[PDB]
Amino acid sequence: MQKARIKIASTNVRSLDEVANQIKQIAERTGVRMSGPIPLPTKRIRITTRKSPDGEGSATFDRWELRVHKRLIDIEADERAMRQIMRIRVPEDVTIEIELIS
Amino acid sequence: AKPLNERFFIPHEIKVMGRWSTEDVEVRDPSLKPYINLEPRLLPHTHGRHAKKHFGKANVHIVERLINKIMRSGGSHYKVAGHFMRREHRSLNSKKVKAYEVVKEAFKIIEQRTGKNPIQVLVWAIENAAPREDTTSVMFGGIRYHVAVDISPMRRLDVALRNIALGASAKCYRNKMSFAEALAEEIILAANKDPKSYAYSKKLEIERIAESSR
Amino acid sequence: MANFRHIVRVAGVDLDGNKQLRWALTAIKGIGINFATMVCRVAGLDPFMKAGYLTDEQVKKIEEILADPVAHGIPRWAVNRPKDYETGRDLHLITAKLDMAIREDIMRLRRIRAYRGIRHELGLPVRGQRTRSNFRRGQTVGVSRKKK
Amino acid sequence: MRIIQTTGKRKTAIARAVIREGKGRVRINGKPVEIIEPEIARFTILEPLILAGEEIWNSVDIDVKVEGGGFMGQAEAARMAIARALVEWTGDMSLKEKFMKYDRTMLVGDPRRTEPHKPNRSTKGPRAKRQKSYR
Amino acid sequence: MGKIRQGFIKRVARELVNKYPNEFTTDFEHNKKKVQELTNVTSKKIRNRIAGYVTKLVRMKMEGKIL
Amino acid sequence: MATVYDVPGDLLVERVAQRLKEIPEIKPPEWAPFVKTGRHKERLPEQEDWWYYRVASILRRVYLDGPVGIERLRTYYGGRKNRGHAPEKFYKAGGSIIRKALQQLEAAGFVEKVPGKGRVITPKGRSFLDKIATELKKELEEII
Amino acid sequence: MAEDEGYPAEVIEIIGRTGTTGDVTQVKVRILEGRDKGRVIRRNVRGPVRIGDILILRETEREAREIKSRR
RNA sequence: CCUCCCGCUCGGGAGGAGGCACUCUGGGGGGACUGCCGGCGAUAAGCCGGAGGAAGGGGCGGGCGACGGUAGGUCAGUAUGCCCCGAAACCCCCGGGCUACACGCGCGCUACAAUGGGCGGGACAAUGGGACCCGACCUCGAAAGGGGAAGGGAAUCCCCUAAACCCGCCCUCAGUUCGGAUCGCGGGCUGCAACUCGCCCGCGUGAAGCUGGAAUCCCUAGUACCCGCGUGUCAUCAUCGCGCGGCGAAUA
């Protein structure tokens, strides 16, 4: 066997949790021991911008959020038990990284 | 440094700034009793937020009130231990933090000469530095008067402490009167009602101009 | 103490006060506040005491650390001018050498016809940028070097 | 013995405190209460410990770790938690009501902490406008 | 500055005491359990208000005059 | 019954700085106070204490930290430099008083460079301290 | 100082507001001093003043007043 | 349980095993609604006061700006009606100009010292940004920086040190040890290249300014006042713009 890390991030809240939940449900029952889906930070990205193209009078200034959230999953299964679980549909728009070590 | 730690064993027990028992004094007048925080305890810095309510500013430790009307004068410019200032003024172009030191050294410099609990000399300087009568250029009904207006115990205190804190910064001006001193030599002479307190010269004039006009 | 005076004479006939040794030399043009405390070390005096508490014997130890400082110690960036007019290795500057050396190099440029020398004659900073309205309301920088 | 873990939070100095029985230990971020240089914010920490008594201060080990920016900030997070560490210990309403009548900065934090710097019309600070003079 | 409950909030609590008056009480949370099940929960904060008014509309219906 | 943890930093520093004169292995080299000093000084002081404090700190800091570097101890002092009317900014000290100091401690056996790339205390640097703090913490109870 | 005569008067009711600067708030006061006792005066009280506050009257012969009103 | 130090042998501290308790992270749920109690009000709406409580009566801070108008602002971001140019009002290039100044004003920074300066020591954050990019740590250099080199495409590493603070020491109110303009020199750094026109470091130089007329601006609480901190754009010009936490009020 081979301890795999699924490191899964997404740009929006609804898309990331459904995959994290589904990954912990399908893997649960087979030849997998699975450590729980741990939430790491939101590296919230602030873009802080000038609205007005005149830059004139008072110019009201847009605050921007890009929030990118990262769930992490350790798993003890084969490379074949890994693809079976990576079958799932996945939101657009959800990055799934795989490191493989023994 | 060892006296400093004795000043940490002693406030514990309980006493203001390390060695002034808050029982030494009493508020003899029943006017300035609910308006003053002589009776409660230990530290001014507190950060207990005031002006929250109608009289959320009466319960302010007398000394904390002192610290931030003694902190007042301040714009823009930048302070740090560097080369670096002024930026914290002849009255804290900056914080109550390095303010609280001044008032402590002024309690030290007013204790050194008078030898009384200095919280008996300052609470004796904020019942005398307040004028008992004021004229407002008040017009009511379109008719311009300059009138008898009597002063409230809360607005008394404020004119007492502020005139004490306004007088010292005219004297400290580029002068050996350090505010730790210039305040400590204002607080003795406002307690006395002396002819040397720029704070008891307005108290009087504001009642005396206001008596003429009535 | 080492024999009180209020006026001892140091660096020729120019006067040493009663302020503090490190501040009394700063005035003597050529010796500053960092260079005063470099010559207190070599000579062997207490730096924080008053000026004027000097016998005759201390006043001679300073005048020979001044004539040539690069002989006693004083690093080749911690001396007054290092590498002078392309052929002197290091020198000393004092009220007469500093006044002459800076007017010389200015006498040099005006003949050269540069954009530094005529920019010191018209009334201007050369690299400080704005002459647009600074020295404002009739005012003046005083350029180099002394209006006291 | 016992382990009663509490918290104390004022203007984002979060104090992590533990109250177990022992011999008069006062630990702050690893160092005794002695290491601090301002006398002042020390006395603030010291306020509750006398209101109850030295009796219970001597009989109990207090270790706190205050991860908070302020010097007075640390102290304040230390004032709120000791007081809550001593009210969980003995259990009575006598030590709780005695704190509340004195000050509410022993047993209430804030409802508020800090406000953002508003976009503003090209100047410095949340609440400020560029100076005018065009009249 | 000043406080006044919105008209959507009063339209809704008024007809909710009209259809099922007797399945409402003078407890806050219970009505709040019922309001949840009858009309939409567009959110949580409004769901406390409608419920806040319905309780007052059961206090006034005892009196004799209800507006 | 004491660590560097138990003693205030105002009483610890003249007791270790003396114990750096007395032992007497660490000493002032002449080039370091002269003009190879840290950033700008309103005056340069002719002090032994000056050298003995810049090192009496260095034995407390490597105690707390593991890999404590040169670039860390240059930036750890606190102090600025003018630019003009532009407000001041944060700069670091002279690396000359820090790179000879660790090496005067390294020959004394108080500090040693670890094989992971860094700077740690020896037992001789760790005991020199706990004895000087057992003397300081004992005196702090005697003195009201 | 010498007293003058401190003529303590505790306010009974706070009728409304006066002054164009707004500054006076007219308060009706009841007296508790050794000479008169009881007198009902309608004095020009400034600054924050609650119901049941104390106000040292300087002169006992006063009562300046202008009145109206809520609808 | 284990390695290191110290010890008055009572006892204090670090490491690793070990443990997810705590802080925290981000996803979800409850809690506040004039519900209750008194007073004012038409017993209605609503306002005031009270208790319990972490928090209260728009809780608090943002985003969220109708029909329109000033022929406001931008065709010099783009989109576009009309007109005009056609070795040119095109195109390529180097160099110079926008950074010229006797002066006037606007917006700001820095500042006129003892609530101070040096020196040393100690206790403290947060947003963020980081691959020709952040750069541990080690070494040389006074330093700016250079040489070597770990980790890091990130809760796991780096910028990083917060600054204000306080305690002791030296210094002892003068245009000064204030203040830093101006000028000589030595020296680094990026780019082809910083004289015009960069910033820093060191030594020398050491200007006005010692609290400012008429007049006038900003803001109402975790705010102002105050202190540093980051980022954008980005080699390099930041006393700017956006944004973070630390101290923490006056009056209404």
Side-chain angles (χ1 to χ4, degrees):
Chain A
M1 290 200 200
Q2 177 177 246
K3 93 175 71 170
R5 148 168 23 264
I6 309 169
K7 180 198 314 206
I8 178 175
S10 203
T11 188
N12 59 283
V13 159
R14 304 178 64 88
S15 294
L16 191 53
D17 194 39
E18 200 171 326
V19 181
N21 189 236
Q22 187 173 345
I23 287 164
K24 82 158 296 310
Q25 197 179 343
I26 194 173
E28 197 57 58
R29 304 305 308 272
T30 174
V32 168
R33 184 192 290 171
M34 199 194 161
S35 187
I38 86 176
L40 303 172
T42 305
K43 300 305 286 196
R44 247 186 303 98
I45 144 274
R46 225 164 248 166
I47 285 176
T48 52
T49 69
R50 251 181 214 162
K51 267 174 136 98
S52 317
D54 273 30
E56 186 52 276
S58 184
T60 290
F61 305 134
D62 273 305
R63 213 188 214 185
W64 302 85
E65 304 177 7
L66 208 169
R67 312 203 165 194
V68 272
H69 355 285
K70 194 173 283 101
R71 317 277 169 284
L72 190 141
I73 283 169
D74 293 82
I75 165 165
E76 183 162 302
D78 308 280
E79 201 193 57
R80 187 182 170 276
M82 176 52 55
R83 187 184 176 269
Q84 201 277 117
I85 292 159
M86 202 160 263
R87 185 68 179 277
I88 186 177
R89 61 216 295 116
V90 299
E92 306 85 76
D93 307 327
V94 155
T95 287
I96 317 179
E97 283 180 65
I98 193 75
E99 198 212 60
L100 291 312
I101 54 161
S102 276
Chain B
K2 157 215 196 163
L4 203 89
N5 290 340
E6 212 163 7
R7 294 188 187 103
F8 144 91
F9 188 63
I10 291 170
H12 211 26
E13 207 176 354
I14 187 84
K15 302 198 195 54
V16 173
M17 276 138 171
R19 45 181 70 186
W20 294 306
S21 204
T22 199
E23 284 278 15
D24 279 23
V25 198
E26 59 174 343
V27 70
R28 206 160 182 283
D29 206 32
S31 216
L32 298 91
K33 180 188 161 83
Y35 293 76
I36 207 67
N37 273 33
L38 188 152
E39 291 178 71
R41 308 191 343 143
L42 185 286
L43 224 149
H45 283 319
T46 318
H47 219 29
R49 14 111 191 194
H50 307 115
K52 174 184 67 181
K53 82 146 185 175
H54 310 275
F55 287 70
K57 318 163 267 269
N59 286 324
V60 187
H61 299 271
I62 321 175
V63 180
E64 194 194 67
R65 315 211 83 169
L66 183 63
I67 290 164
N68 205 299
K69 288 164 188 169
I70 300 286
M71 98 154 51
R72 79 302 130 124
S73 196
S76 288
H77 27 106
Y78 215 79
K79 107 171 71 162
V80 195
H83 311 152
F84 295 60
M85 114 135 67
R86 222 236 270 95
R87 334 94 91 177
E88 86 162 0
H89 211 262
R90 293 182 322 192
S91 273
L92 276 309
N93 204 320
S94 299
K95 309 301 334 188
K96 152 160 350 178
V97 212
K98 193 60 155 204
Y100 165 96
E101 175 231 65
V102 174
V103 171
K104 185 168 183 172
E105 294 179 342
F107 285 131
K108 300 304 288 181
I109 297 154
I110 195 158
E111 191 197 68
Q112 271 187 237
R113 205 197 165 166
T114 310
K116 279 155 40 183
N117 201 296
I119 206 180
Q120 205 166 313
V121 191
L122 185 73
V123 175
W124 198 248
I126 72 175
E127 326 176 35
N128 303 324
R132 303 156 192 257
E133 184 186 43
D134 200 339
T135 191
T136 318
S137 184
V138 284
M139 44 222 75
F140 191 81
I143 173 162
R144 297 193 191 227
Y145 301 95
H146 294 92
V147 187
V149 187
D150 297 63
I151 198 159
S152 180
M154 183 170 239
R155 212 89 192 288
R156 286 184 69 161
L157 204 180
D158 268 311
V159 181
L161 275 179
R162 183 185 55 260
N163 281 331
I164 293 157
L166 200 163
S169 69
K171 288 192 295 190
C172 179
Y173 105 95
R174 314 89 217 202
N175 199 228
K176 232 272 166 181
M177 295 299 99
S178 151
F179 208 106
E181 296 203 294
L183 191 65
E185 318 307 314
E186 196 57 31
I187 299 159
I188 303 158
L189 309 179
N192 294 307
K193 306 170 295 308
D194 202 60
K196 187 194 157 178
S197 41
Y198 202 98
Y200 200 73
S201 196
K202 290 174 286 186
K203 194 281 192 163
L204 288 173
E205 184 186 291
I206 296 160
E207 295 156 332
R208 186 65 188 271
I209 295 172
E211 174 287 316
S212 179
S213 281
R214 71 178 208 232
Chain C
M1 296 168 169
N3 209 350
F4 27 67
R5 289 202 189 77
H6 306 84
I7 352 179
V8 193
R9 288 171 165 177
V10 308
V13 77
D14 272 289
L15 301 178
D16 203 55
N18 194 250
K19 308 177 285 188
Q20 215 182 53
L21 286 162
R22 311 272 62 71
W23 318 329
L25 300 186
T26 310
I28 295 182
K29 290 156 53 53
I31 313 97
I33 193 163
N34 286 318
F35 206 90
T37 199
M38 288 185 228
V39 308
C40 178
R41 292 182 172 78
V42 167
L45 306 163
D46 219 32
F48 73 97
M49 69 163 178
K50 296 291 198 71
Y53 295 83
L54 307 167
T55 53
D56 287 299
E57 189 182 327
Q58 330 293 47
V59 177
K60 296 174 171 67
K61 258 290 156 183
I62 305 292
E63 177 172 10
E64 69 184 326
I65 297 160
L66 294 171
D68 301 306
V70 302
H72 295 274
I74 319 302
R76 334 302 267 208
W77 43 275
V79 78
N80 297 278
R81 262 170 102 236
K83 179 46 61 191
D84 309 82
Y85 46 77
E86 300 157 56
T87 189
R89 186 177 57 146
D90 281 80
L91 285 177
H92 186 70
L93 293 185
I94 194 167
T95 193
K97 306 174 198 282
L98 170 85
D99 286 39
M100 188 51 226
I102 301 183
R103 184 172 53 259
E104 183 178 61
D105 205 301
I106 292 170
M107 194 164 71
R108 193 188 325 180
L109 295 159
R110 296 177 284 177
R111 306 180 164 285
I112 292 165
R113 299 183 300 280
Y115 196 72
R116 184 177 302 174
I118 195 160
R119 199 98 181 271
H120 314 328
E121 294 179 282
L122 295 159
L124 317 172
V126 190
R127 55 146 196 269
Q129 189 193 302
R130 290 174 68 260
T131 55
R132 168 163 89 191
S133 209
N134 61 301
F135 50 94
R136 44 170 182 168
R137 293 207 174 179
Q139 283 263 224
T140 202
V141 175
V143 204
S144 259
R145 67 183 85 159
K146 176 63 63 156
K147 308 167 68 167
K148 284 284 154 55
Chain D
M1 73 142 167
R2 40 186 166 181
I3 173 200
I4 307 175
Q5 207 171 6
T6 185
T7 180
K9 188 184 166 183
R10 263 270 272 198
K11 59 189 180 291
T12 64
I14 291 151
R16 286 95 60 68
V18 195
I19 192 165
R20 51 150 151 156
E21 54 182 275
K23 76 285 284 171
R25 191 51 178 175
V26 190
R27 203 160 74 161
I28 176 158
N29 289 119
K31 307 92 209 277
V33 70
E34 303 160 71
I35 194 162
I36 294 163
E37 314 294 351
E39 295 176 279
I40 311 149
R42 201 150 72 207
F43 313 148
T44 291
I45 306 157
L46 206 56
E47 290 190 43
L49 298 157
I50 295 293
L51 193 41
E54 298 179 309
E55 310 114 45
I56 204 71
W57 184 27
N58 194 68
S59 295
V60 85
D61 256 25
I62 312 181
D63 62 291
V64 72
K65 292 202 80 167
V66 194
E67 287 210 295
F71 224 151
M72 191 61 174
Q74 273 171 297
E76 290 248 329
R79 169 176 181 160
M80 192 189 167
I82 268 69
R84 198 175 153 210
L86 299 154
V87 170
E88 287 181 301
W89 195 262
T90 194
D92 289 86
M93 297 220 87
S94 73
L95 197 70
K96 194 171 183 65
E97 297 291 328
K98 179 190 303 186
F99 294 162
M100 293 195 169
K101 289 161 172 54
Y102 169 48
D103 286 85
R104 288 293 291 270
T105 189
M106 311 173 93
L107 290 161
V108 199
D110 283 315
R112 33 61 161 195
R113 319 296 177 184
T114 191
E115 282 199 23
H117 171 191
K118 280 63 181 157
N120 307 125
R121 60 155 167 163
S122 304
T123 183
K124 308 185 173 199
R127 313 270 192 104
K129 275 189 176 204
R130 164 181 66 164
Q131 285 206 137
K132 190 168 298 212
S133 164
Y134 311 149
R135 310 171 65 139
Chain E
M1 301 154 170
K3 185 272 152 205
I4 168 57
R5 156 199 277 120
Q6 263 248 325
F8 202 76
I9 301 162
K10 293 195 166 79
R11 186 210 64 162
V12 183
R14 284 291 304 104
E15 94 158 332
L16 238 63
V17 303
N18 191 246
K19 297 166 192 173
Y20 313 109
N22 308 128
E23 295 161 85
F24 297 107
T25 54
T26 69
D27 268 57
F28 178 73
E29 181 175 292
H30 279 73
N31 303 320
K32 198 164 55 54
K33 197 64 56 46
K34 198 60 168 61
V35 162
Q36 179 183 252
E37 297 170 306
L38 289 172
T39 187
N40 283 280
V41 180
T42 186
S43 213
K44 169 193 178 59
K45 208 149 158 170
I46 200 176
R47 196 222 297 130
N48 295 282
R49 303 185 179 288
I50 289 163
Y53 198 53
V54 164
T55 309
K56 202 178 191 165
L57 296 168
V58 169
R59 291 308 310 229
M60 300 156 63
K61 186 168 63 193
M62 299 166 186
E63 188 193 293
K65 201 189 287 181
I66 175 161
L67 303 162
Chain F
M1 193 181 65
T3 325
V4 282
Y5 287 70
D6 307 19
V7 187
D10 329 320
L11 301 320
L12 185 70
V13 77
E14 71 143 351
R15 200 75 70 263
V16 181
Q18 281 167 45
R19 300 276 275 177
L20 300 161
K21 303 168 194 199
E22 202 168 6
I23 199 168
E25 300 178 304
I26 307 91
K27 59 182 187 180
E30 184 49 49
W31 67 80
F34 212 110
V35 74
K36 310 173 173 67
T37 34
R39 195 83 303 172
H40 191 260
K41 306 300 198 73
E42 192 201 46
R43 253 172 61 209
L44 302 92
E46 294 164 30
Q47 293 189 60
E48 292 286 297
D49 284 298
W50 175 86
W51 184 258
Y52 294 120
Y53 309 151
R54 287 293 192 175
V55 182
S57 182
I58 292 168
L59 288 166
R60 177 60 173 286
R61 299 293 91 138
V62 177
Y63 196 120
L64 297 173
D65 313 317
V68 64
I70 307 180
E71 301 92 65
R72 203 154 288 183
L73 299 168
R74 212 205 281 178
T75 203
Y76 226 96
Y77 97 115
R80 297 176 179 279
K81 231 267 148 167
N82 220 338
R83 284 165 86 213
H85 293 297
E88 285 193 319
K89 287 290 159 67
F90 202 88
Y91 282 102
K92 309 169 294 312
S96 34
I97 323 156
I98 294 159
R99 85 161 177 286
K100 302 291 184 289
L102 296 162
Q103 265 100 271
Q104 280 304 129
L105 294 166
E106 193 135 282
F110 297 5
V111 309
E112 189 187 52
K113 289 197 290 182
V114 75
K117 296 176 171 196
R119 197 72 58 149
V120 288
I121 77 296
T122 47
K124 288 179 291 187
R126 189 163 231 165
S127 182
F128 177 67
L129 288 161
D130 292 300
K131 294 167 172 297
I132 295 165
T134 303
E135 180 182 47
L136 287 151
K137 194 263 157 184
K138 198 175 296 180
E139 287 172 35
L140 303 185
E141 307 183 315
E142 309 281 309
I143 192 170
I144 199 68
Chain G
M1 293 186 71
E3 209 177 8
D4 193 36
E5 79 159 21
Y7 191 62
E10 304 188 322
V11 292
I12 46 164
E13 282 178 54
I14 172 162
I15 183 159
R17 64 276 178 88
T18 316
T20 230
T21 181
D23 177 61
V24 39
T25 316
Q26 187 175 119
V27 193
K28 204 165 49 159
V29 213
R30 189 192 50 74
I31 273 59
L32 181 59
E33 193 239 17
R35 209 267 287 213
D36 257 304
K37 302 263 199 182
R39 183 211 275 240
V40 187
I41 201 173
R42 294 171 62 169
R43 276 293 312 139
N44 286 21
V45 199
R46 63 138 85 277
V49 165
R50 309 184 65 96
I51 194 167
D53 282 11
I54 183 161
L55 199 66
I56 177 165
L57 303 189
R58 303 235 296 181
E59 190 167 337
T60 70
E61 306 271 302
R62 285 283 144 197
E63 199 173 357
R65 33 76 69 202
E66 297 189 36
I67 183 164
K68 84 175 289 297
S69 53
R70 216 191 183 259
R71 172 199 59 246

